[PDB]
Amino acid sequence: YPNASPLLGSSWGGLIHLYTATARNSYHLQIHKNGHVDGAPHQTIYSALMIRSEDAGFVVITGVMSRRYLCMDFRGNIFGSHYFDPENCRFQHQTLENGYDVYHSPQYHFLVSLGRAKRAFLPGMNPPPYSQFLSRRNEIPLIHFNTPIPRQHTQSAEDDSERDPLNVLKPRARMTPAP
Amino acid sequence: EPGDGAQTWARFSRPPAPEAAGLFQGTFPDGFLWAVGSAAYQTEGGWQQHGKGASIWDTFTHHPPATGDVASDSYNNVFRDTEALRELGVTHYRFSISWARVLPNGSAGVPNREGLRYYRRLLERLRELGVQPVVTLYHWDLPQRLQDAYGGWANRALADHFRDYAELCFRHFGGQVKYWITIDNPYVVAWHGYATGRLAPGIRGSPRLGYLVAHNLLLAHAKVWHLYNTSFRPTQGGQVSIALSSHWINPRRMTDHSIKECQKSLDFVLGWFAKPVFIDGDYPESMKNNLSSILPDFTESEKKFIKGTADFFALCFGPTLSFQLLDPHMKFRQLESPNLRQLLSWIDLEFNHPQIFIVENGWFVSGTTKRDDAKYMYYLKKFIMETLKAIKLDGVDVIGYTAWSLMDGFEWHRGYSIRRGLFYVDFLSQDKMLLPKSSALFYQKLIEKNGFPPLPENQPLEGTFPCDFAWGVVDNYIQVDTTLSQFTDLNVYLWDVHHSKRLIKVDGVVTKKRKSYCVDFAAIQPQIALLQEMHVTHFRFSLDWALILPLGNQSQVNHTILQYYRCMASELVRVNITPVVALWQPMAPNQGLPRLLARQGAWENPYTALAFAEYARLCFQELGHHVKLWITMNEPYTRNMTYSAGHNLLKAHALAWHVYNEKFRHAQNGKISIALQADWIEPACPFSQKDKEVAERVLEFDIGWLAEPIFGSGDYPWVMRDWLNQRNNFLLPYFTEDEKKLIQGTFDFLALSHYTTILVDSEKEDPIKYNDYLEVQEMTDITWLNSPSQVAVVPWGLRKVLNWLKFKYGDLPMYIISNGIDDGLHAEDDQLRVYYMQNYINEALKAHILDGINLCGYFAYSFNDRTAPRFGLYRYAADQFEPKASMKHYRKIIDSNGFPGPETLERFCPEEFTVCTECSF
Amino acid sequence: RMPVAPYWTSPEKMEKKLHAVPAAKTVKFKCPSSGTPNPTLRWLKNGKEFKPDHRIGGYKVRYATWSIIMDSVVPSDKGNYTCIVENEYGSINHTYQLDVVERSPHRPILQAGLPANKTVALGSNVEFMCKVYSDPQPHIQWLKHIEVNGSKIGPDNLPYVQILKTAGVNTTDKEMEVLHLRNVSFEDAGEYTCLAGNSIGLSHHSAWLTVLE
Amino acid sequence: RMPVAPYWTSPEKMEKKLHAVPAAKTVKFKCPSSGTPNPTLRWLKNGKEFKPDHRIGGYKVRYATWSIIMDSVVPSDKGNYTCIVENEYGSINHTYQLDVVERSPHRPILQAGLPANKTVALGSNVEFMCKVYSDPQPHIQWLKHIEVNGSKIGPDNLPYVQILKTAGVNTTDKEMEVLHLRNVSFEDAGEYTCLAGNSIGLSHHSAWLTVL
Ligand SMILES: O=C(O)[C@@H]1O[C@@H](O[C@H]2[C@H](O)[C@@H](NS(=O)(=O)O)[C@@H](O)O[C@@H]2COS(=O)(=O)O)[C@H](OS(=O)(=O)O)[C@@H](O)[C@@H]1O[C@H]1O[C@H](COS(=O)(=O)O)[C@@H](O[C@@H]2O[C@@H](C(=O)O)[C@@H](O[C@H]3O[C@H](COS(=O)(=O)O)[C@@H](O[C@@H]4O[C@@H](C(=O)O)[C@@H](O[C@H]5O[C@H](COS(=O)(=O)O)[C@@H](O[C@@H]6O[C@@H](C(=O)O)[C@@H](O[C@H]7O[C@H](COS(=O)(=O)O)[C@@H](O)[C@H](O)[C@H]7NS(=O)(=O)O)[C@H](O)[C@H]6OS(=O)(=O)O)[C@H](O)[C@H]5NS(=O)(=O)O)[C@H](O)[C@H]4OS(=O)(=O)O)[C@H](O)[C@H]3NS(=O)(=O)O)[C@H](O)[C@H]2OS(=O)(=O)O)[C@H](O)[C@H]1NS(=O)(=O)O
Ligand SMILES: [Cu+2]
Ligand SMILES: [Zn+2]
């Protein structure tokens, strides 16, 4: 009757999307195969993240379709990277008193943001826009992730003087000798 | 109404169901018209006999040389044509009255009574046999007098002459004939007669002349149909139509601009005449918004004249227009398809559900082709299956099918280089006998069966596989990740419990390393959990020889990879899943070998055979306590290896088998054999003896090459040796007596890998696709369901190859060691995998129960999609494994132990009775 | 006077498609309109018409800024909220989506009784188990209390441990739930600690393994 | 025009100083004045000038009604918010004590395994623990499943409570965790629950009890 949902813990190991918002527009942190992170207004398959903490309170954000790792340069601009560089690509997580997550780098001090004015996490003092996150759990089915799915438009004998359009003749590749 | 057919490419973009419309069978309606067709210039011959006037095909082919003067000589041979009609069992014969034969000088003049009595004798023979005639008045053989005197169909004064001539025909033959076609293919008459010059008069005027000629063709057809409707349909009660040929067209990419360009293509080609005749009397507005000065205008009296002026839709869908004479400007940068089912749905939608008489249909073969036409037969099978799908699955009102060209003849711009006949005609002969082709026997048996009834060899069987049947899955690329998950950190730490639970390292203090178990390997237990979800009894995987011995020899045995393999095996035995292990597989970077062994000839080297024997001895020493079922070679590519490579691969198999049999069988009590790939090879024509000989040759070159030394007589098969001797190919090596007794018995079971069947044909259809080595045209039935990678699911070939292996090598234990298909998209290809696995396991059940082979296992191909992508029974996405629907259906097959039926208490096995396992010895 | 159909005064303020807030927050949905006459405002939660008795606490529906103000947002408030503003010359609508995400800023709560004390035979198989309930992403460690150097206790009063298992950026969340001990010796006997921790704090549950025979 | 101190414009709307406000609400402190001429408004966080990045979330100043608005108020927002309005003739001060009372942004978290499935050995001193995590102290009800209606839920979620031990502010919150239970033989052996609930939701944990 009550308690209709899944506990309050066991669900930290699944794919989430890092929602963030300021009061004109709302995004999800999206890691592309380009390595360029941006905001998608809906749960995209490039915004599905797998957050794994390597220390107690220090999370690592990857992004499962991009196969990247959310890292941050020396000036705050986050990006994706295929290789885990454990000194800049690992973020200390905190929860604020309003219930939002913030993720700051331990050395560069800059908050993970989707806005321009990338500032540093001073505790209790107004984080920059698109930097207070919220872990929305995944609603995309798994089949929408593996989508190269190329229907091979081969078009055998592209000229329209074809003797075999329906492809009856179907030769197998062999090895012929040379005595 | 024009525009109702633009929903066709949306109607067929959704994928059909494999279990519903993949072995779609059924019979045609009763009263379906099974017809065979002919023209006049194509078949009759006698171009001047009995005073026949000159046609415009006796001027195009006499120097406008492969002329149609004596084409099939059917003007004199009425009897053998009608005998071919009788032995074909056909219901209707479409033939064509020629204009110049019965009216040489004109309607202003007396008719030629000898040509008229030829058509009368043909019709009375058709009445003796009980076949009904379908008669084309005009099948492109316009007389030369009208072309000379008026300019042909460029003049509107021939519509009177075509009204007079047809009146003659309606007076003479209308009491017998109840189906008339005025003009066959007015597209190509108008467009390659007077706008391209490729056809009958060869004018090469302009497209303006082509549209004016089509204008006059529509007017002449309307005049003839109104003559029939006024003065002949009361007394005779026949039907008059016009035979419109259409292509079918498909979008370059599925945007609505491409779809309206496809509808514009079909309006320019087929709607050109089918919108006047069937809809409103006037051209499509797609052509009236395009060339309204070139396209002539209809008077509205001529819009009520040419409206409703056909009693049925007469469709021609063959090689005349489709892919040959279709104007590429009328394709509108789209892709033409030979899809008759989508075209028939387009006729049903666009022209207000007509009764479609497919009045010419087929494909062709080459002119060098005798009575063995498998390509024509499978195009005819696909086309008749597409009309049956249009009748059944689409509600299209197809009332008849006409297989085109009863006999071989002229082919109008392709001379005699092309054969569309059902009956083979030797054009150099004098008797010109009609010898039945493969397509004639197919079409006769299809008219007799009235379509595709359900065969008794394709209906599912109820029954169970025996106890200790090996229900397995394979993974040829196991994930070898030797990263230990626990007990790797050996430093000693200080745990400040209270003010902390930070961990401070006591520097310098390192404890002892624990003995490594295989709960330490983190990559092992997810795979085994997915295997326990599958309910499989056996799991098959291969070892990487280049990882055990990365230097070829025993000097640098990587015991970490070997411990990973041993603990994969032992943690499979722990959960009651028997591991089957392949020593070598070619599915690898360099032939499955170490890089030192791969760089030294690599199977031509006999040291590779000795090194495989030593590597197999190491594998039986290490992993052999847990693996009790070994595969020596895992499906070698017999189509891509040299005869010396296969010779030393057989020697390597025999050396590893003798190592196991002498040194390791009594200690471990396991079995070892080779896995060979056994795809079935079926003759393309089921009653051709030459195709049976070719099928046995491809079977002995494919399967029997490596199976006959091991499972047979110890030598290479005599079909193989005899085929290579007669072609001066002495590259197949000979076994010495010691080698022959070494390899002759090196098996404990037969492990076969079966995926598809291939049809084979002895005839050289085209030499580019032809295999000159084995003298075989490999081909496929295109009514078979296919995968996205175009491999045919055809389940009875599993039963057929199991029966062939029992016939060739005896009643051995047989493991179907791999069987599966691939996927391409969201979820519709796993409906194909469910259909595949259901019907192939049912045909294995048929081969076990009905045919009595000793089948001991079925192994589904590809455990997951991470390792073998798109083949797997587990979808691998976002770094998770999700079970596909084929996983659940295969698990239901495993748990039921087959297909048990309505009553099931079927165990009956304590202390197992069947003998294909390790018994009391 | 003029029969002005209603329009959005500012569609710049209306392009936030999804409002995902923590629970017990306040959410204002605004859809500012104009027109002659003043077109009345209506809200529909999940298609059905949203009235202030469908929700505990209700809402302010103040029309001077055309906004609904739901105070103390509960997870039984998720779904679509459609602003339909209507008058006799026309009507328009705009659908917001409200997700509610419950937030537990606590230490990782371990399941009670896991891991449990185990006495076992020699050379058997022992699986210690801990379930960790953390709303942030936790780090789980499996430690064994080492007593190798002297006694159990280090230089200060902090016990010696050895990290048997640790969670990384390649470790699945199910992998750390269980520590497996195959063929247990007498040296594999003592205190085994599942220590979980996030940014809020660290918790731990200890168990004891003793070997019979 | 006239050198007079700027006066307040609220007779009985500027006398609520102690603001007992729940967490994640919106506070609005207004100090409405009418300067002679246009005065100087400033807001202070108990001594320092309150610049908008001193609050997680910021704050909105409304010069039209001289009101500071702090939405989604946090527990750290307690203090003395000071409104000072100056002009050239003196200045006027006012204080506002904001005391944010806090509440959990979740249901009551019940620790799993509390309570657990028992094997009650024929009338023991059985005890049923339930650890509850909530910042407002929740309502606790147990719902001993009794053998009415047959099924566990029939016509919409039967009220199976008969327990006098309820939640209470006066009594101590530590030992309402455990369920002191007596007379445990085969007359009551079924499904137990631990309903703890607050302003956000209700949470239940189920355990079985079996007397041999
Ligand atoms: O720069 C920048 O910034 C940027 O830029 C850019 O950028 C990016 C880019 O792109 C780049 N470049 S490139 O080229 O390269 O690309 C670079 O640059 O980078 C960048 C980045 O950025 S950053 O950020 O990083 O920097 C961009 O641009 S673009 O354009 O492009 O876009 C961007 O980004 C930017 O920008 C933009 O945007 C922004 C935003 O965005 S986001 O997204 O981010 O978001 C913006 O901005 C912002 O904003 C602005 C504005 O808006 O203005 C500003 O602001 C602020 O402030 C203001 C004000 O001011 S003052 O000074 O004047 O004061 C504000 O305003 C306001 O608004 C509104 C609000 O409020 O909000 C309004 O109000 C209204 O409503 C209300 C409602 O409420 S509720 O409730 O509903 O909620 C109301 O009220 C109410 O009511 C009342 C009555 O009724 O009365 C009351 O009540 C009660 O009581 C009474 C009594 O009393 S007494 O006193 O009288 O006694 C009674 O009567 C009654 O009845 C009662 N009631 S009951 O209930 O009881 O029954 C109540 O209470 C109330 O309530 S409460 O709550 O309040 O309490 C009211 O009233 C109304 N009013 S009226 O009058 O109107 O009606 C209004 O409208 C107003 O107000 S006023 O007064 O003024 O009028 C606002 O809001 C604010 N905002 S915030 O922010 O804060 O939020 C600002 O500053 C800004 O910020 S920032 O940060 O941004 O800066 C814009 O848009 C733009 N900008 S620009 O310039 O740039 O362009
Ligand atoms: Cu809390
Ligand atoms: Zn053939």
Author numbering:
A (entry chain B): 25 to 203
B (entry chain A): 34 to 97, 119 to 975
C (entry chain D): 148 to 360
D (entry chain E): 148 to 359
Publication text:
To reveal the molecular mechanism underpinning the coreceptor role of HS, we solved cryo-electron microscopy structures of three distinct 1:2:1:1 FGF23–FGFR–αKlotho–HS quaternary complexes featuring the ‘c’ splice isoforms of FGFR1 (FGFR1c), FGFR3 (FGFR3c) or FGFR4 as the receptor component. At the membrane distal end of each quaternary complex, HS engages in tripartite interactions with juxtaposed HS binding sites of FGF23, FGFRP and FGFRS.
Consistent with the 1:2:1:1 FGF23–FGFR–αKlotho–HS stoichiometry in the cryo-EM structures, size-exclusion chromatography–multi-angle light scattering experiments showed that the FGF23–FGFR1c–αKlotho–HS quaternary complex migrates as a single species with a calculated molecular mass of approximately 220 kDa, which matches closely the theoretical value for a 1:2:1:1 FGF23–FGFR1c–αKlotho–HS (215 kDa). FGF23–HS interactions are mediated by three residues (Arg48, Arg140 and Tyr154) from the atypical HS binding site within the core of FGF23. Compared with FGF23–HS contacts, HS interacts more extensively with HBS in the D2 domains of the two FGFR chains, involving residues Lys177, Lys207, Arg209 and Ser214 of FGFR1cP and Lys175, Lys177, Val208, Arg209 and Thr212 of FGFR1cS. Similarly, markedly fewer fluorescent dots were present on the surface of the L6-FGFR1cWT cell line when cotreated with FGF23ΔHBS and soluble αKlotho. These cell-based data confirm the indispensability of FGF23–HS and FGFR1c–HS contacts in inducing formation of a FGF23–FGFR1c–αKlotho–HS quaternary cell-surface signalling complex. A Cu2+ ion (orange sphere) is coordinated by analogous histidine residues from FGFR1cP and FGFR1cS. In addition, we introduced a A170D/A171D/S219K triple mutation into FGFR1c to target site 1 of the FGFR1cP–FGFR1cS dimer interface as the representative of the three quaternary complexes. Interactions of the FGF23 N terminus with FGFRS D3 were corroborated by a 300 ns all-atom molecular dynamics (MD) simulation of the FGF23–FGFR1c–αKlotho–HS complex.
